[PDB]
Structure 1
Amino acid sequence: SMEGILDFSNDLDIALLDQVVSTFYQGSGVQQKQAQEILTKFQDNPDAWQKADQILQFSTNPQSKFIALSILDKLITRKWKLLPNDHRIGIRNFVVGMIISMCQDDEVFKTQKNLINKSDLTLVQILKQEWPQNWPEFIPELIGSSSSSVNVCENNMIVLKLLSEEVFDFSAEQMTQAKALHLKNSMSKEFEQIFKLCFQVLEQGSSSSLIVATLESLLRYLHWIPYRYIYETNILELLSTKFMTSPDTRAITLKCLTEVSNLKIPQDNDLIKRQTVLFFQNTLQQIATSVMPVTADLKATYANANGNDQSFLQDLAMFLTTYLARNRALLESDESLRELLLNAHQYLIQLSKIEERELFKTTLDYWHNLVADLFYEPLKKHIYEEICSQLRLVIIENMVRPEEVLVVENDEGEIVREFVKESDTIQLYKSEREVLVYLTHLNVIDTEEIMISKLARQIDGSEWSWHNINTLSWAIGSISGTMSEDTEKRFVVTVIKDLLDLCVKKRGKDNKAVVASDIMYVVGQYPRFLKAHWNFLRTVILKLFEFMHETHEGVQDMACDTFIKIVQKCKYHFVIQQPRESEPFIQTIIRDIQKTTADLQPQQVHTFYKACGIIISEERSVAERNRLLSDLMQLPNMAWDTIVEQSTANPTLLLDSETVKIIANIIKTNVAVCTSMGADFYPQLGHIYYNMLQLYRAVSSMISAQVAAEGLIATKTPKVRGLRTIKKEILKLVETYISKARNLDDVVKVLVEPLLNAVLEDYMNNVPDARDAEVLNCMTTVVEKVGHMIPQGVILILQSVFECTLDMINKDFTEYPEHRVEFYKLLKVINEKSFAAFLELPPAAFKLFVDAICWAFKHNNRDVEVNGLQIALDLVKNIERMGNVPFANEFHKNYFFIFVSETFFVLTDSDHKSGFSKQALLLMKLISLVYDNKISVPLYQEAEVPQGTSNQVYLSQYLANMLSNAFPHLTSEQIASFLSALTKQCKDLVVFKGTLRDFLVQIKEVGGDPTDYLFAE
């Protein structure tokens, strides 16, 4: 019964319409979902706009009228110039008439402002289409009608507000360059009249409703109008005094003054500077007397959240930071402005104590701006000495937890390990560190005194707390590098001693975990001090080893990160033999590695072996390094040697899930050490390589055998997943080493040969769900590093992975997402390093290659999209490099227009806007080949065009015909003008892209002006 309004043959029952509308907004459940579908079908009916006047006059529902105007908006924006002139004036009339009617009825104007704003916006859409060329008296008539009434005048400010937004703030990407410049100049020419009306209202007005609307419109004008309207009138006085006292106008006025503040003023004119000083001086005076003094507790006010206090404190912060970042120097030389300068900053100090991360970031951005200037600008920092001192307390007391601290208090009072990384506080910590480092350089004595005294009031318990000891420790760690070595020495010594007292005094598993994490972070942040104090560095490392036995997993996991963090910076002191030591400390670490890492989780053990690898690589005595390496790998190599004896003698131990886990961890240990030793790992790789590749084969047979006996579901079992982990870690170890190898002859002669034999055929002959995308990733590194040395090896890779992988990923854009990405990385590196491998492909396989590239264009996945467009560019270049040879000639004849049309399709379908730049670049290259005559042969068949017609002519005909059928609502002239402009600009990427953007605008509407494509002249 609700579907009656969808029959347009019979007349439209508005009573039924309002019921469907009410069922959608006020109803629920199924009745709501059914009405929603009906209302969509009604709105999307191309004749629905003819019911517009009917619904607006006779409907007793404002939502029904709103939806009627949405139907008109869509009609005006997309099909206006398709209507006869009769309906264009008729539609204009009952839109203007509806606005007038609603403004004269005070009750309607009061209670239906949503419907009035939608009507105003609909009117503005008409203006964009026909003002001023077909409506030159719109602004004069608007100014006149504003004297006739207050409601009309107020509503006229809304129309002008929306108009300024649509022309200046949102015209780009919604209209052509030509039409945007037309409406900007049209509005600019008639603005002096608009300003008079707006200024007269502001001066004599008393209707808060109309004043706010006028200030709301003024906020939009300040985005583009000449400076003289702002400064050469009395309007800054009005904004900074009158409209700051009343809270009804304060919020919008403060936003108006933030836009003025952001302007870069003529720095030679003394009066502009005087005015810029004055509206600031006035504004801060109104705050102090009408809102709150500079001593007020803004932290408490924000937390209370009365009325709009939180929004006003936000706008205030935005105003103070904008103005001062631009104009504080205007206040720094005049002694009579000094108090104003400091009061403004004192409000900022109070704003920086609010508990609201995003607001704190806004203020912290300004502090960084300030301290960075005081760090370089002569004779400035003494002005802000007191401000900076207060700021040191604010930063230190609001330090966020560093990424390295892995302990945290839960909702039970317990100290525990973190579930997930606090990814949204990484950036905030770096920002606080950056400001606090600057503040420390500006007064290192003051910062030390704040931190030492604060730490002294932690010992005696004056201010002991987990929050307080934490922020303090994090602050101490974050300023590393600002002090002198000698001051840092005395400083750190005192911090450790006081922190070592706390861990004794504060007992309990929770307390001990807090202080332990804080000492770890501080010590780990001062490498310079550890290098110079070997005996302490040694004690630290040994105490970290003790924490590797802590039952508290947070402490334990952090001791492992701290260890490798210290090693990355102090590695050199572990590889040499220190005085009073019988051997380099790396030899003591390795000898007890089983005891030290006994209670660690396997991936923590790997981090430990990687850290040892960092140290071993500092030894440049090849003999000694290789000796250390084999000592480190002694445990995994003894475990390895036993596995090989058992597996090769009886391929049924790998059935044991426990043995699979042991193997995987051995390979993972070799990955960890290889990651940090790189080229120096080769001796260890050679010890396991040939046996490791045999294990890859044996594991592969097991996986296949279990898929055949249990089905595809077997790939989800822990057994098979364990076997594939072995294969993936082996691939990762070979990828990791080849990516850092320095001796590429050994890679070719020793490694690549058996590698390709072990992986390629296994990949090719497995079922899709059993293929490992890591194969593709490994092969990409092989081609990247040595592909230029194994031309026949690259061919073998294509034959094995190209067609079978393409068949996996060419049925949709969703399945096998890992294979999809690595596939196009592989084609990319091959195309730029071994293009010859593609010349050796049979014509049919080279056609799948081209199909594969255009397939990547149509992805929304950015990972494969950008590679698809890059392969296409590089393929074009690889071909033209060949010159006038048969393969290049036949390439263009076969695939040139395919790339042009496929590039065009993704440019214009509104589903691939993310890759517009590279699409445009690719299309520009293609067109420039023809207009430079770099295609040697004709792009057309002998009998489709006169003899001797140039490729330029035929290209313009092919494209004209293509666009004509793809976009039949375009006139022949639009297409011809567009192509003429496009081809003339194939050496100007900026202009070429502009011409494309203008096209994407015009295909969204009817009647686009073809001269718009002459904009670049």
Structure 2
Amino acid sequence: IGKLNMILVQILKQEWPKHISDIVGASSLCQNNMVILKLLSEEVKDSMCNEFSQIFQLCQFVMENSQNAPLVHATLETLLRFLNWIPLGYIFETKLISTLIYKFLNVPMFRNVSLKCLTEIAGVSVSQYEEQFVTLFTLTMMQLKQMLPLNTNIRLAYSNGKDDEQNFIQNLSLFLCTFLKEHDQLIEKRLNLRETLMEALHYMLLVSEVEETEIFKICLEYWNHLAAELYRESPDVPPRRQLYLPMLFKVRLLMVSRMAKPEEVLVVENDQGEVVREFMKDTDSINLYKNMRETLVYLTHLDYVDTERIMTEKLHNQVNGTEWSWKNLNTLCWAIGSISGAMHEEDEKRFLVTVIKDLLGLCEQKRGKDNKAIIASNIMYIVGQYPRFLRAHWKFLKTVVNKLFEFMHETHDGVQDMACDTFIKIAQKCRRHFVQVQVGEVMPFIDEILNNINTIICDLQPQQVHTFYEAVGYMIGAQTDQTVQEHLIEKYMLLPNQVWDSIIQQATKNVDILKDPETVKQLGSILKTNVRACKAVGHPFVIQLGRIYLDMLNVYKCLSENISAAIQANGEMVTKQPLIRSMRTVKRETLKLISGWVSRSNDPQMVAENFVPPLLDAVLIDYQRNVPAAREPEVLSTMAIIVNKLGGHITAEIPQIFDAVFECTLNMINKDFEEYPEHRTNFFLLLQAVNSHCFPAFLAIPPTQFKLVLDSIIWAFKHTMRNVADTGLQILFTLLQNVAQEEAAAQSFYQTYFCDILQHIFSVVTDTSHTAGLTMHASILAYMFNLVEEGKISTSLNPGNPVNNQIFLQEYVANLLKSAFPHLQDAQVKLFVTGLFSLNQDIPAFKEHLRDFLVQIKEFAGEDTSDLFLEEREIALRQADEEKHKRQMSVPGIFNPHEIPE
């Protein structure tokens, strides 16, 4: 009856660790006891682990003397669960390995469970018990060779085998992988065990051929581990490498054959037999590609010549049609592109010359349209990942760019997108080579591209047009000479400028044209193109922005008027219409363009003098008057960026910005979280920017608005979600630091808000709802305690009567703690508060003392304290990730050339 099992599980859930005794009474209920132990193991450091000796003894006794196969099986799983907790002496001394490796591992009924148990034992890493580990692997290999001989075709067996056989293959792969990852070096030192190690490697190779993804992942883990270990030994032949040389070439050949699809490839063959664009993706694919690239890079570093020979031979076979196939070409080209940094430059020159020549020759050979789509994708993937080769050879750069322009006219879904992406990759990495007169050219290549820009882009859709314009913009940013850079920019934005001028000329005589959907779409596209061009070029783009500034804001105002009129005359439902969304998109792109240029600018005086006033006039009032659904969140982000950049030059306009934007947005955020997420983020970014750079503004706004600001900050760090709470802590700490630098303002602020902030912070801390930010709470509390202790406050906090601030604040904190935790005794709280004050000058000690207090309170309350140490665990994880990243950065080729800073 499962009801009894569920009742037992519930009883175990009732803090069993705090309070195996049942199985001590074990005597056909033995299988029931085993199932109960399995459930307990699922429910579950050193939780009286010595008591697990009872479980092991029962398991041994049942295993040795019981003939009931189901009972033995259930005991086998029960033992499998507890091998990680039973003391190592029992497993490594009580004849455990021998009994199941002999009696059960050969029996088909227990083969899977027995192998799984052996896998768990092999995973235990211990300095001693070396002889036991050696016996385990030497004995297991011989036993499994009898049933699964090395000559068996594991690929076919798994393909046609039943579930049991597939499970056995998976278990064998896991066992070999884990043991070798843990104890391979022990076997290598035994001279007589060379053949057994060779047989294990052979087994790993054969299993790798299995098509199923999980088995290949298991094998790839071990291959990556081995490749990493060999490479780190020595980036004569070293000892360990000399032992693995015969098998390395087979592993390399297998790895090249089965390479996974990179993310940069947007066109993939569909299993129906046709080539279609990529429309499905899985997080597992990225991890698989990362692991395969890492392993292949390590193997390439171990031997350049073999890798080059293998790839050249495969490519040559592809060219002559001996083994022509889409899958083979795809895998080979992905492998070639995935080692883009491993080889030295000198050898990379030859390899890439041959590869590019062969691929270009092959492109003109095949005739099918689908064939050119597959071939073209590989061509534009290889070249995209080898900017170093292109920068050195002008002819190949010219040829590849021309070929990309040719592919831009292909009438296929993914080829055009890949061509634009690869053009961005090439231009962004080879800037200076386009704006210079090369050896064999009469004028810079940028001039050729610009003069024929109309013909190149005729077949591209708007997104691809924007991508191409960004790519070309990256090329103009490298023209150092401003006198020529301005001419390049003027010729660069000629077509969008013509369309914009035509639209504005039409509007000037009949404003109704702005309501035509086609005109709105055209304006949106032009604004998107300008945004991308500004993102690429950078500061020198001001010439275009200054050209289209006033007209852009006039269009913004007209669109705002039209949308407001529509919403007013037909309600808030109209915001869902297509035309209204297009108009809002136009407004959004205007704001994004302004924000981008301002963030890239470096002349605050000119920006404040020329650009800010019209923007404020056009934007501020419209945001205030619009209904909550029609308010654009990008206004807050733009204002935050302008405040961050201009700093003191805009502090005089902060009162206007808050009067128009502040209170309206606050009422929109606090009522309910999910209503307006983006508005919240932008609003807090703007508030943080103002607090950091233009603090004196807070003294200019009326005191009621400052009260609202403080209420918003308080609501920020009392929120449930973490990130908004962290932002609130940061803003509050910065505000406390800033206010202390002004004499009268400091006294007024302390007298008005000092106690409330302490009360709120203590309420947050005691409730233990934001343990992630305990460090910030400690920092703020220490800061305020230092302020009071040093006498920086010249007026009594208590308004009833003058009194020393120290005594009053200590009593106040004691009262706060007593109310939060009524069971506390007076002396305990008094001592805690007395000790806390003395540590206000040492933030780590303050934090540790506060955490100790909370820990003891929780332990008395009987609540888990794990969450109270979240910061340390997060720091440990971050440090581990940083160390892993640092280690990889030292190995060329693991990171794409587009990921390494340059």
- TM-score, normalisation: structure 1: 0.76
From 541, 546, 549, the equivalent of 2:406 is 546
User: What aligned pairs does 1:105-504 form with structure 2 within 5 A after superposition?
Assistant: 112=1, 114-125=2-13, 128=16, 131=19, 139=21, 142-143=23-24, 145-146=25-26, 149=27, 151-152=29-30, 154-158=31-35, 168=45, 184=46, 187-188=48-49, 190-192=51-53, 194-266=55-127, 269=128, 272-290=129-147, 292-304=148-160, 306-378=162-234, 379=238, 380-410=240-270, 412-419=272-279, 424-504=284-364
From 423, 430, 437, the equivalent of 1:577 is 437
What SS does structure 1 have at the residue aligned with 2:613? helix
What SS does structure 1 have at the residue aligned with 2:268? strand
Aligned residue for 2:895? Answer: none
User: What aligned pairs does 1:502-521 form with structure 2 within 5 A after superposition?
Assistant: 502-521=362-381
- For 2:438 and 2:859, the matched residues in 1 are separated by 72
Aligned residue for 1:791? Answer: 651
1:924 paired with 2:784, answer no
Would you say the 8 A contact 2:486–2:543 is kept in 1? yes
- For 2:739 and 2:43, the matched residues in 1 are separated by 46
Aligned residue for 1:955? Answer: 813
1:523-563 per-position Cα deviation (integer Å, ceiling 9, x unaligned): 22222222232123212211211222222232222221121
Would you say the 8 A contact 1:392–1:436 is kept in 2? yes
Would you say the 8 A contact 1:978–1:995 is kept in 2? no
1:890 paired with 2:752, answer yes
- For 1:954 and 1:208, the matched residues in 2 are separated by 71
Task: Using the TM superposition, name which of 570-579 and 327-336 deviates more.
Answer: 327-336
Q: How far is the alpha carbon of 1:191 from its aligned partner?
A: 4.7
Q: How far is the alpha carbon of 1:655 from its aligned partner?
A: 1.9
- For 2:853 and 2:98, the matched residues in 1 are separated by 45
Task: Using the TM superposition, name which of 218-227 and 801-810 deviates more.
Answer: 218-227
Aligned residue for 2:446? Answer: 586
1:799-842 per-position Cα deviation (integer Å, ceiling 9, x unaligned): 22221011222322221232133222322333333344444444
Aligned residue for 1:717? Answer: 577
Q: What is the percentage of aligned positions where both structures have the same residue?
A: 44
Q: How far is the alpha carbon of 1:956 from its aligned partner?
A: 2.8
Task: Using the TM superposition, name which of 849-858 and 279-288 deviates more.
Answer: 849-858
- For 2:827 and 2:661, the matched residues in 1 are separated by 43
Q: How far is the alpha carbon of 1:326 from its aligned partner?
A: 2.4
Question: Quick one: structure 1 residues 130 and 901, their matched pair in 2 at CA, closer, same or farther if it must change by over 3 Å?
Answer: closer
1:686 paired with 2:546, answer yes
- For 1:938 and 1:231, the matched residues in 2 are separated by 71
Question: Quick one: structure 1 residues 582 and 857, their matched pair in 2 at CA, closer, same or farther if it must change by over 3 Å?
Answer: same
What SS does structure 2 have at the residue aligned with 1:706? helix
What SS does structure 1 have at the residue aligned with 2:105? helix
What SS does structure 2 have at the residue aligned with 1:405? coil
Aligned residue for 1:601? Answer: 461
Q: How far is the alpha carbon of 1:576 from its aligned partner?
A: 0.8
Would you say the 8 A contact 2:797–2:805 is kept in 1? no
Aligned residue for 1:564? Answer: 424
- For 1:977 and 1:336, the matched residues in 2 are separated by 70
Question: Quick one: structure 1 residues 123 and 605, their matched pair in 2 at CA, closer, same or farther if it must change by over 3 Å?
Answer: closer
Task: Using the TM superposition, name which of 834-843 and 805-814 deviates more.
Answer: 834-843
Q: How far is the alpha carbon of 1:782 from its aligned partner?
A: 1.7
Q: How far is the alpha carbon of 1:160 from its aligned partner?
A: 5.2
Q: How far is the alpha carbon of 1:788 from its aligned partner?
A: 4.2
What SS does structure 1 have at the residue aligned with 2:652? helix
Would you say the 8 A contact 1:981–1:995 is kept in 2? no
What is the count of residue pairs matched by the alignment? 851
Task: Give the AA of the match of 2:762.
Answer: V
- For 2:614 and 2:722, the matched residues in 1 are separated by 35
Q: How far is the alpha carbon of 1:298 from its aligned partner?
A: 3.4
- For 1:983 and 1:359, the matched residues in 2 are separated by 59
Question: Quick one: structure 1 residues 412 and 216, their matched pair in 2 at CA, closer, same or farther if it must change by over 3 Å?
Answer: closer
Q: How far is the alpha carbon of 1:977 from its aligned partner?
A: 8.3
- For 1:367 and 1:981, the matched residues in 2 are separated by 58
Task: Give the AA of the match of 2:227.
Answer: V
- For 1:150 and 1:954, the matched residues in 2 are separated by 66
Q: How far is the alpha carbon of 1:566 from its aligned partner?
A: 1.4
1:774 paired with 2:634, answer yes
What SS does structure 1 have at the residue aligned with 2:232? coil
Superposition CA RMSD, Å: 3.6
Would you say the 8 A contact 1:900–1:926 is kept in 2? no
Question: Quick one: structure 1 residues 548 and 819, their matched pair in 2 at CA, closer, same or farther if it must change by over 3 Å?
Answer: same
Q: How far is the alpha carbon of 1:208 from its aligned partner?
A: 4.0
Q: How far is the alpha carbon of 1:859 from its aligned partner?
A: 5.4
Question: Quick one: structure 1 residues 234 and 728, their matched pair in 2 at CA, closer, same or farther if it must change by over 3 Å?
Answer: same
What SS does structure 2 have at the residue aligned with 1:419? coil
Q: How far is the alpha carbon of 1:671 from its aligned partner?
A: 1.0
1:119-157 per-position Cα deviation (integer Å, ceiling 9, x unaligned): 4324535673874xxxxxx74x843x33xx3524x4445
Question: Quick one: structure 1 residues 707 and 749, their matched pair in 2 at CA, closer, same or farther if it must change by over 3 Å?
Answer: same
Q: How far is the alpha carbon of 1:846 from its aligned partner?
A: 3.3
1:871 paired with 2:731, answer yes
What SS does structure 1 have at the residue aligned with 2:439? coil
- For 2:83 and 2:248, the matched residues in 1 are separated by 34
Task: Give the AA of the match of 2:775.
Answer: L
User: What aligned pairs does 1:934-949 form with structure 2 within 5 A after superposition?
Assistant: 934=788, 936=793, 942=800, 949=807
- For 2:384 and 2:550, the matched residues in 1 are separated by 41
Question: Quick one: structure 1 residues 731 and 997, their matched pair in 2 at CA, closer, same or farther if it must change by over 3 Å?
Answer: farther
